Design a protein around this ligand. Structure first.
Ligand code: MG
Lengths: 59, 456, 462, 52
DNA sequence: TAACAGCTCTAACAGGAATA
RNA sequence: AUUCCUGUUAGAGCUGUUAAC
């Protein structure tokens, strides 16, 4: 599944809402999902944020 | 030891309507936004014809005439919304049939009503409607009415009157919405009006609603069977159904036979691989020949060792096959505590063991009720006090309860024949069962595949 | 560190993760060709890694001269394959150790040469910067040396971890199913084979919970008796013998029994009986799952033990047992809670009486008690129900059955189930593991300890 | 399938939008058997030239 | 192939209408 | 058969365990 598909986005968001997570584009969500995925591991969090915003995709 | 795996409550799936305005509650969304196909104007005006004995033509005409007037629900008012009429709710005019289209049931049918011959009665009804074979373009949906006086031939051992009639007419490609005396008594007029209006609109060719944000690359197969009580042994009729979504906005829900003789409801290697080749072809034609990245199969009984390999050998490596068996009868049942005043939430699935989960297809739904806003609604509170959780047994899926559970939960909401919020089973299972009955009654249907709008 | 954390951490940096050691070889061959996890070490032959790589790509694999591994690693000419065969690769492993984190699977240690190899690799300033991950199929089954080395590395400041995953091939399949941007040819080659024995992990217990009707059974094994016969017997003959004799014991064929010896001497004469011995079914769940005779025998044994000392009557309906309330003992104080639960709008509620519109049918409250073998667990399944005194006239009260239960909603059904649990076990579902025993005054008795609290689970949340 | 005779009336009225809508609405009979027909050969008589 | 146990489903009827 | 699936009454098919033929 490609994340920018509407169907896959809706399915993933429904799954997230199934486990009681915040609903939609609401505050304390971005940090919430970061702290959920990386379970308070700031080195791995930094490495992922570096990889996503790395200096190869920037034009 | 009294601790179980954490349950997860799948949210209520959304339905797609006109201008892609989503809503969980189907009838309310139909009132607010209209049918999904209203933007395409696919049905246009709806033109319908009659076929009934002349003595009860006034009652058939009265129900159709009522269809064009508002109705307010008195039963199940906690769920049903005010009806606004076919012209307003569906944004489509309802056409009064002309005398040329209107037909009368031939007299000898009444006579054969005394004889108690179901096959003769069905054939005589088909010959009565034969006056409408040439004028297929004039009308879209036929409204066959069977009077209560024919109840002797309605149902008896080895024969089903509606099943036989639809099995005879489907090859004729005429869409009928059989109406019996039941329609006009279920005290609540809005209930029946929603039912008939949605059935006729979908029967006409329109799509009242579609699964919101449904993946077009996944095909949900469903296999069911039916019993024919042979004199010497038993006969098992197995038929498949597909509910995939093509490249366009079209729903594409079909039913077909799996075929020479079967004494057990378990498809062998050859038969299962053949039917899975056959349903794949229907998906490819609708989807421009692209293969399905994931296949769901819902069988009422467990998959055999040979049957799983048959399902596998029919597809390529890219396809993901999640074989699932759906069990309706289980010893388990759930009670919701926070003791909740309303039963356990619909969609709450509980993973019991590896490849065994409990799905609460039946249950309370939030925000659907009309009266007393902001309160849960239990659809089956009339029949059962508490919901009965169905059980999924996984046989092939690599991983993930969410995929199958959400897919099934959403599938239990696109039964247009059903005028309530949901069902107990995915539409694949119920339509495979209906077509299994149709094929069991009429053996000369096995060759061709049929759409859902015929047998719904 | 749970495998999910290991997968999130391993997937993010698979370019620089070393591997020390059929989907698993196949996924590894695809993973190498893909230039990820450049260096792989191994102990054994398994010459199938290079064959799989050749099948994947079509070119030979460098397999390991004096310092050929050193030359290949220092020149950065990946992918590199070297077998320990246990100091030629020792210098190379130490050189590899700083460059990328290592994960070792399929190895329990037990070899001092590689043990000292790894311990010497740990000491340097930046050793295994990404981490050392030990993946064994089961944590508790691993050798003590592995845990000792993990603790030593953690004390040294390295980020070594011991994570529990499945089999190495299954672990690699789960890893590869989430690796991104893989060429079409490789995916066609591997395709992760096919998963016949589906086994998806149950999530954590987590914390609007639902309360089920299932009572756990923790009695993992029971003791029972065996009788030896000089002639073959059929189950139907035994069943009709019990029906015609009605002993105070439970019988089945697999011939197996539970009760008093004199009852066995009554049911079976001396001539047909050879000897009486004992049977110890070590795994009750597996036994009742494999054999249906054991299932019926065990469920009937639990039923007999459950209503042995209680005034409630025990009935049977389509081979399902029911705990039906007798009319004579319906006035007990223990039923008072049930009197409250059936009661309408907070009043006393009748639990046994006469149906309003039938001549002689008498209705009572009851619960169907069943045995459910789920996974490897036994559950006692309680279903509230309305029993009718004539077994074959039940349908004549159908409307009444619909009338009484019409408003037994979630709160009312919750009260009914709690009251029935209290009646059947005498204690509430808080810290309850009460014990029952069937035929306590017999040589072959069965004691079962049933958890009093019904099974339940809380929805996982943040 | 057969086009509605109302298409002729619309064409005589010279309304292109309604004519196209009616031609599309005539497709419902083929819609059920969407599985049945891979392609569709829509013909337009010369009498509709006024709306072409 | 003939019993036995359990799991599960369909075949025919009947049947009331969604927290009272 | 506008619908929903709750009950009742039965039977079959799957598995098993025995007895064999
Ligand atoms: Mg219908």
């Amino acid at each position: 599944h490609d994340i920018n598909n509407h169907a896959i986005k809706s399915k993933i968001q429904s799954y997230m809402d199934s486990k009681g997570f915040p609903l939609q584009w609401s505050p304390e969500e971005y940090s919430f999902y970061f702290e959920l995925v990386f379970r308070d591991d700031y080195e791995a969090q930094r490495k992922y944020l570096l990889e996503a915003l790395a200096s190869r995709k920037v034009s | 030891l009294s601790q179980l795996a954490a349950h997860s409550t799948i949210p209520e799936p959304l339905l797609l309507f006109k201008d892609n305005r989503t809503d969980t509650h189907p009838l309310r969304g139909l009132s607010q936004y209209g049918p999904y196909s209203a933007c395409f104007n696919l049905p246009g005006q709806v033109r319908l014809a009659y076929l009934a004995p002349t003595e009860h033509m006034r009652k058939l005409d009265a129900i159709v005439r009522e269809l064009q007037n508002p109705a307010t629900p008195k039963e199940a008012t906690n769920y049903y919304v005010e009806y606004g009429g076919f012209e307003k709710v569906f944004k489509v005019p309802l056409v009064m049939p002309q005398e040329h289209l209107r037909c009368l049931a031939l007299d000898e049918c009444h006579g054969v009503a005394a004889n108690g011959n179901g096959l003769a009665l069905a054939d005589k009804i088909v010959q009565s409607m034969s006056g409408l074979f040439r004028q297929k373009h004039a009308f879209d949906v036929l409204l066959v009415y069977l009077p209560a006086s024919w109840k002797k031939c309605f149902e008896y051992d080895g024969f089903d009157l509606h099943d036989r009639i639809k099995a005879k007419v489907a090859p004729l490609n005429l869409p009928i919405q059989i109406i019996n005396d039941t329609a006009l008594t279920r005290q609540c007029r809005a209930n029946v009006m929603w039912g008939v209006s949605v059935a006729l609109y979908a029967k006409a060719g329109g799509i009242p609603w579609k699964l919101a944000d449904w993946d077009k690359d996944e095909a949900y197969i469903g296999l069911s069977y039916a019993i024919k009580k042979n004199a010497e042994g038993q006969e098992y009729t197995t038929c498949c159904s597909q509910v995939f979504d093509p490249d366009g906005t079209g729903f594409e829900f079909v039913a077909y036979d799996t075929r020479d003789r079967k004494g057990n409801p378990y498809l062998s290697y050859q038969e299962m691989q053949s039917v899975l080749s056959k349903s794949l072809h229907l998906y490819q034609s609708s989807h421009n020949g692209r293969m399905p990245r994931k296949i769901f199969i819902h069988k009422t009984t467990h998959f055999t060792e040979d049957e799983i390999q048959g399902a596998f050998d029919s597809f390529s490596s890219s396809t993901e096959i999640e074989l699932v068996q759906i069990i309706q009868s289980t010893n388990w049942y759930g009670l919701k505590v926070d003791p909740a005043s309303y039963p356990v939430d619909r969609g709450l699935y509980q993973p019991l063991t590896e490849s065994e989960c409990l799905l609460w297809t039946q249950g309370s739904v939030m925000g659907v009720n009309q009266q007393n806003p902001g309160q849960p609604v239990f659809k089956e509170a009339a029949l059962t006090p508490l919901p009965n959780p169905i059980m999924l047994r996984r046989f092939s899926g690599n991983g993930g309860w969410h995929a199958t559970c959400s897919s099934i939960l959403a599938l239990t909401k696109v039964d247009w024949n059903n005028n309530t919020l949901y069902k107990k089973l995915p539409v694949t299972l119920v339509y495979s069962q209906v077509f299994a009955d149709v094929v069991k009654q009429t053996p000369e249907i096995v060759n061709e595949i049929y759409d859902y709008r015929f047998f719904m | 560190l749970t495998d999910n954390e290991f997968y999130q951490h391993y997937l993010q940096n698979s370019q620089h993760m070393m591997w020390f050691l059929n989907i698993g070889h196949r996924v590894l061959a695809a993973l190498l060709e893909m230039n990820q996890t450049k260096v792989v070490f191994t102990t054994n032959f398994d010459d199938v890694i290079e064959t799989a790589f050749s099948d994947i790509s079509g070119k030979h694999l460098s397999v390991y001269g004096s310092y050929a591994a050193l030359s290949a690693l220092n020149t950065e000419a990946f992918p590199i394959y070297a077998k320990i065969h246990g100091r030629e690769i020792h210098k190379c492993f130490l050189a590899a150790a700083i460059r990328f984190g290592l994960v070792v699977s399929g190895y329990s240690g037990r070899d001092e040469n590689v043990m000292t190899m790894l311990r010497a690799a740990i000491d340097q300033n930046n050793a295994f910067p990404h981490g050392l991950y030990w993946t064994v199929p089961s944590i508790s089954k691993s050798e003590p040396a592995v845990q000792d080395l993990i603790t030593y590395a953690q004390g040294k400041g390295v980020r070594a971890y011991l994570v529990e995953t499945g089999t190495f091939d299954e672990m690699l399949s789960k890893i590869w199913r989430q690796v991104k941007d893989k060429p079409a040819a490789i995916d066609a080659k591997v395709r992760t084979a096919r998963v016949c024995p589906v086994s998806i992990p149950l999530p954590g217990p987590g914390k609007p919970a639902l309360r089920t009707n299932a009572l756990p059974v923790v009695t993992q094994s029971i003791r029972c008796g065996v009788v030896t016969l000089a002639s073959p017997i059929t189950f139907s003959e035994l069943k009709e013998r019990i029906s015609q004799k009605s002993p105070k014991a439970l019988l089945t064929y697999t011939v197996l029994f539970l009760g008093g010896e004199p009852e066995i001497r009554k049911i079976f004469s001396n001539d047909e009986i050879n000897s009486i011995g004992q049977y110890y079914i070590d795994e009750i769940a597996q036994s009742v799952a494999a054999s249906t005779f054991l299932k019926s025998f065990v469920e009937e044994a639990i039923l007999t033990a459950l209503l042995r000392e209680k005034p409630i009557l025990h009935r049977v309906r389509h081979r399902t047992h029911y705990a039906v309330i007798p009319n004579a003992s319906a006035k007990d104080d223990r039923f008072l809670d049930l009197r409250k639960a059936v009661g309408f709008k907070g009043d006393l509620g009748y639990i046994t009486g006469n149906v309003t519109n039938a001549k002689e049918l008498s209705w009572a409250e009851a619960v169907s008690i069943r045995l459910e073998e789920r996974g490897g667990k036994l559950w006692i399944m309680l279903k509230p129900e309305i029993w009718i005194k004539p077994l074959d006239r039940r349908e004549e009260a159908t409307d009444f059955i619909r009338s009484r239960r019409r408003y037994r909603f979630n709160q009312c059904s919750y009260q009914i189930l709690d009251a029935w649990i209290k009646i059947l076990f005498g204690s509430i579902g808080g810290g309850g593991t009460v014990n029952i025993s069937c035929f306590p005054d017999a040589e072959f008795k069965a004691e079962f300890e049933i958890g009093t609290r019904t099974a339940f689970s809380l929805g996982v949340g943040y």
